[PDB]
PDB file of C-alpha atoms in Angstrom:
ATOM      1  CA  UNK A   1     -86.234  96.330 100.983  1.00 17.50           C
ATOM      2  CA  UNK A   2     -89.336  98.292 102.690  1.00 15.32           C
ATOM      3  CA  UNK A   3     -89.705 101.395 100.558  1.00 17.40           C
ATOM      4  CA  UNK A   4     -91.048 104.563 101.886  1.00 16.23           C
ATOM      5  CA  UNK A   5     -93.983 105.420 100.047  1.00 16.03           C
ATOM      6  CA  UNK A   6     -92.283 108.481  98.348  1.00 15.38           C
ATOM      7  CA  UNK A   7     -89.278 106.576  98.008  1.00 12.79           C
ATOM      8  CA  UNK A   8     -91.838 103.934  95.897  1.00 14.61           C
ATOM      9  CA  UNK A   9     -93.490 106.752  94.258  1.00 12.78           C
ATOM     10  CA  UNK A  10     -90.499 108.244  92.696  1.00 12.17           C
ATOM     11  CA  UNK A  11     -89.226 104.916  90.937  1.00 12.78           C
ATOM     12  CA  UNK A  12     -92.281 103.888  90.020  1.00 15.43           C
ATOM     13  CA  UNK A  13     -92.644 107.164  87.825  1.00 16.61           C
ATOM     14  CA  UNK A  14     -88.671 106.651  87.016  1.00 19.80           C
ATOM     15  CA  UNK A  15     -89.791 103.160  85.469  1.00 22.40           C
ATOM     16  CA  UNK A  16     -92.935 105.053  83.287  1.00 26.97           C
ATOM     17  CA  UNK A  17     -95.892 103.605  85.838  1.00 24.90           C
ATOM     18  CA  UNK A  18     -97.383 107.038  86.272  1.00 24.92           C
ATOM     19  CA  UNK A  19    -100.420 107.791  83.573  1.00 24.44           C
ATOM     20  CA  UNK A  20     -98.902 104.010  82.219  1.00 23.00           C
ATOM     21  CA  UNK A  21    -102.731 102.990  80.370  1.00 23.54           C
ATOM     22  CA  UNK A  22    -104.160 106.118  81.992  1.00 24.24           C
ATOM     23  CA  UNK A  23    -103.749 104.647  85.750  1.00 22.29           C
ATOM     24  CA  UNK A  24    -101.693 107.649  87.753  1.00 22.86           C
ATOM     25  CA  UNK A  25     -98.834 106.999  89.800  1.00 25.19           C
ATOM     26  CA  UNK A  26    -101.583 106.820  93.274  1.00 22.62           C
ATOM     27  CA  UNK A  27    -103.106 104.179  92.085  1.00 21.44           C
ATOM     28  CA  UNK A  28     -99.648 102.168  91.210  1.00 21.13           C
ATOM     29  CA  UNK A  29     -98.808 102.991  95.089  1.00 17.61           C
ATOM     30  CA  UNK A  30    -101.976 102.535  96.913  1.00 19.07           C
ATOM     31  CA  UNK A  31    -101.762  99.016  95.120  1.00 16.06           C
ATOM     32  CA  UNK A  32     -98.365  98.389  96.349  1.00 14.82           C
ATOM     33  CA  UNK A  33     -99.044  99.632  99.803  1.00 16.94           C
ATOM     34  CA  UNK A  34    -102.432  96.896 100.088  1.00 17.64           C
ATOM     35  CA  UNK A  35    -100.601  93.839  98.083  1.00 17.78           C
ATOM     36  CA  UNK A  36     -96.900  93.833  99.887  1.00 20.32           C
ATOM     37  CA  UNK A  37     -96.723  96.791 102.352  1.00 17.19           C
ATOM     38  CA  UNK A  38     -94.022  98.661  99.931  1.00 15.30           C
ATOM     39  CA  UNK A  39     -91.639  95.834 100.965  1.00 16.06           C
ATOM     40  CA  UNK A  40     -90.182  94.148  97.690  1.00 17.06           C
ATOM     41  CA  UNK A  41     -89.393  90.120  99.940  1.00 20.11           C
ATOM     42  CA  UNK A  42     -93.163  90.173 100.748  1.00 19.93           C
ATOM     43  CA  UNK A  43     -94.168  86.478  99.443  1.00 16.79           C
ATOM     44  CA  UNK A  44     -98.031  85.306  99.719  1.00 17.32           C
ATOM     45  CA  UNK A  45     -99.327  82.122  98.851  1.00 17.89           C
ATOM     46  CA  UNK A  46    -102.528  81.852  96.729  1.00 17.06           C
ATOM     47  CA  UNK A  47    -105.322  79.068  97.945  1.00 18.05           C
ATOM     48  CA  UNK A  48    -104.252  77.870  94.450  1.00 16.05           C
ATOM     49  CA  UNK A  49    -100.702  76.879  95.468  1.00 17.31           C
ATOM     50  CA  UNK A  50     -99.401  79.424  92.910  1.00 14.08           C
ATOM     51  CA  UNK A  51     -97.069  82.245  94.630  1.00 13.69           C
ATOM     52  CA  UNK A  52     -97.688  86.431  94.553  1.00 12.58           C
ATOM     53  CA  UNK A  53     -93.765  87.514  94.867  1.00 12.06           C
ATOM     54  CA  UNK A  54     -92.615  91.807  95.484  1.00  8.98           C
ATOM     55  CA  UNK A  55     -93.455  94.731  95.370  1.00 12.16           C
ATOM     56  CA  UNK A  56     -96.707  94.354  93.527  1.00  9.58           C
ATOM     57  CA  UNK A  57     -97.674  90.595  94.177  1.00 12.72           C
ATOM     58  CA  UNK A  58     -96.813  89.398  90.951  1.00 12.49           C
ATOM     59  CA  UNK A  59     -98.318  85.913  90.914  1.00 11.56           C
ATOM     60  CA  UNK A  60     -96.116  81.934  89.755  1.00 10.91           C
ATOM     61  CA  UNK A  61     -99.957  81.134  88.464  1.00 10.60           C
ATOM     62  CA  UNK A  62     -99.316  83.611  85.127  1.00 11.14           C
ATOM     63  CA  UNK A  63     -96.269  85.592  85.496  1.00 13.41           C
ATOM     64  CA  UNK A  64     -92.884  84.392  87.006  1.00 14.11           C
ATOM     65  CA  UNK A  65     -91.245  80.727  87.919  1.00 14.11           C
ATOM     66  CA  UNK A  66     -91.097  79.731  90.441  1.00 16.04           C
ATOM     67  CA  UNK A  67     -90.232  76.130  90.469  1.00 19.66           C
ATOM     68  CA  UNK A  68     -93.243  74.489  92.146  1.00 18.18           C
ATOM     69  CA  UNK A  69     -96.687  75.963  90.614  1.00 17.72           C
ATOM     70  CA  UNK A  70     -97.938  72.899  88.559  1.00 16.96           C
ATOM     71  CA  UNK A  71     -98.949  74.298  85.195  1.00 16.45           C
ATOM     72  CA  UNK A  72     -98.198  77.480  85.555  1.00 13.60           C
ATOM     73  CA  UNK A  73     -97.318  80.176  82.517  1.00 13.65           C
ATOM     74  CA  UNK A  74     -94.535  82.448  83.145  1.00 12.23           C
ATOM     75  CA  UNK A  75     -95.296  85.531  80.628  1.00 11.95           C
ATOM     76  CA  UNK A  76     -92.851  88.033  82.019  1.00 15.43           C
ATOM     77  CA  UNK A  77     -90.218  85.033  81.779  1.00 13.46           C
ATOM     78  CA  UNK A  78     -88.580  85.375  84.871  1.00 14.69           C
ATOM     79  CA  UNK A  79     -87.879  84.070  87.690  1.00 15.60           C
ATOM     80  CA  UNK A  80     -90.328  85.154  90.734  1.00 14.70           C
ATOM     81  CA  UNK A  81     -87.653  85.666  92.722  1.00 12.68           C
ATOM     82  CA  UNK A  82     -86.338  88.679  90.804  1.00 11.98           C
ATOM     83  CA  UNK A  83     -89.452  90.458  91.703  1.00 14.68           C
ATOM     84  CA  UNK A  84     -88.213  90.569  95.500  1.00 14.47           C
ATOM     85  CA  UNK A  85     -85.156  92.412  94.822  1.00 18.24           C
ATOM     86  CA  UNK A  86     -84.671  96.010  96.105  1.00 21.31           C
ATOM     87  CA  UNK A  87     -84.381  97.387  92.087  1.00 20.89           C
ATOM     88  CA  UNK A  88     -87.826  96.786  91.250  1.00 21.36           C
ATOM     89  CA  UNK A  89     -87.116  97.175  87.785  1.00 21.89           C
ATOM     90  CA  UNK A  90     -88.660  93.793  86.911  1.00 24.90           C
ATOM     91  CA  UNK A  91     -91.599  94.067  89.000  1.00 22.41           C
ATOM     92  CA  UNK A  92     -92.685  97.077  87.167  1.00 25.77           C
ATOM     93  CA  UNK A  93     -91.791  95.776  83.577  1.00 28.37           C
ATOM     94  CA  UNK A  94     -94.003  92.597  84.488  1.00 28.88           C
ATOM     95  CA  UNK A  95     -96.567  94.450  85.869  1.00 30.17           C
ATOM     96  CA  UNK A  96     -96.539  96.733  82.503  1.00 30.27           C
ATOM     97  CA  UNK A  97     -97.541  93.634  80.831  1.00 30.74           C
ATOM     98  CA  UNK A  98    -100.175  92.565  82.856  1.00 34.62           C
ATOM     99  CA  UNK A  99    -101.764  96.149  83.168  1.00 35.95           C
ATOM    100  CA  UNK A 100    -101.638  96.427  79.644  1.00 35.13           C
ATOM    101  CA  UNK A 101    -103.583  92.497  79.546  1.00 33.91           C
ATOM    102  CA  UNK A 102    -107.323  93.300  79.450  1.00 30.57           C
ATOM    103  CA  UNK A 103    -108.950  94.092  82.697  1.00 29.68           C
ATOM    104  CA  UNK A 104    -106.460  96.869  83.903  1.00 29.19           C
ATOM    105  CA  UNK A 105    -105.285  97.235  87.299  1.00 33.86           C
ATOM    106  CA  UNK A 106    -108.280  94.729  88.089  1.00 33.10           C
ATOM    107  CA  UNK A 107    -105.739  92.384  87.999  1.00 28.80           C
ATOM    108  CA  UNK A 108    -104.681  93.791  91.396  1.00 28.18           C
ATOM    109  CA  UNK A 109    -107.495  92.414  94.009  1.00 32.82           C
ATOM    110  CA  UNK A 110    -106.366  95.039  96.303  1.00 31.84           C
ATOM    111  CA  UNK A 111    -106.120  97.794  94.168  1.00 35.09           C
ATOM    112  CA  UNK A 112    -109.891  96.608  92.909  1.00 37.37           C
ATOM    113  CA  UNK A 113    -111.513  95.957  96.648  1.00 35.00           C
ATOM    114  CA  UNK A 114    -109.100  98.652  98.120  1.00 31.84           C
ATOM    115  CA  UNK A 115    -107.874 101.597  95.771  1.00 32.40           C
ATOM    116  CA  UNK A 116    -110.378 101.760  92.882  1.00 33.55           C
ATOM    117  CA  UNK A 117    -113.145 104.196  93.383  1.00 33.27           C
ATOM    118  CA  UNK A 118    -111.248 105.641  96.397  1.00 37.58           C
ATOM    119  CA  UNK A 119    -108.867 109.411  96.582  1.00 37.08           C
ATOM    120  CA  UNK A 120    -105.887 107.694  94.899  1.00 36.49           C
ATOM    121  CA  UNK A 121    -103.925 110.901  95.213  1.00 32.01           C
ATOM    122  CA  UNK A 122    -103.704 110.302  98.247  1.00 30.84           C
ATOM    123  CA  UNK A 123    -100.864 108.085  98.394  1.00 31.79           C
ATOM    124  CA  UNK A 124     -98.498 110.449  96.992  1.00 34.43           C
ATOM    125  CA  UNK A 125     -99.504 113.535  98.783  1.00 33.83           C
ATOM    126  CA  UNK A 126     -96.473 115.157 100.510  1.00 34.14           C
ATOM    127  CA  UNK A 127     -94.357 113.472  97.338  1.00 35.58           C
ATOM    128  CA  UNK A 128     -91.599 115.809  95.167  1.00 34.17           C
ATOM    129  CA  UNK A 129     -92.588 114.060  91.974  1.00 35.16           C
TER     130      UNK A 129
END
């Protein structure tokens, strides 16, 4: 499913990703936007042969299973196909755990190279919140 951004917005702050660790709900979508394009089958492969799967790019390497990333860890213990369905209840569970992991949304390359430092507000202007 492609969300709108909206759309994205408002279950993201349904799930508790808005102010989750301080990081308001712009900064949850801008990342979303810059990792799948708000479209929860976007599926990436990592020079590493591990697998970014949804909404937010949730990576076989740490996170999910996949089947097929050699000595991989699978912390949110599911499988990374869950993350691509159109509830993205999972996705933003997992990504709860990872936010709350040390370095933040840093985990996020494109929130770090494209959201951080920038108007994150932005991305939910126009929003009913």
């Amino acid at each position: 499913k492609v969300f709108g951004r909206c759309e994205l917005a408002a279950a993201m702050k349904r799930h508790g990703l808005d102010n989750y660790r301080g990081y308001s709900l712009g900064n949850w979508v801008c990342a979303a936007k810059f990792e799948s394009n708000f479209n929860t089958q976007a599926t990436n492969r990592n020079t590493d042969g591990s697998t970014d799967y949804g909404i937010l790019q949730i990576n076989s390497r740490w996170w999910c299973n996949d089947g097929r990333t050699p000595g991989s860890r699978n912390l949110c213990n599911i499988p990374c196909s869950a993350l691509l369905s159109s509830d993205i209840t999972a996705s933003v569970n997992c990504a709860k755990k990872i936010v709350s992991d040390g370095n933040g949304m840093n985990a996020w390359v494109a929130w770090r190279n494209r959201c951080k430092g920038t108007d994150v507000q932005a991305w939910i202007r126009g929003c009913r919140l």
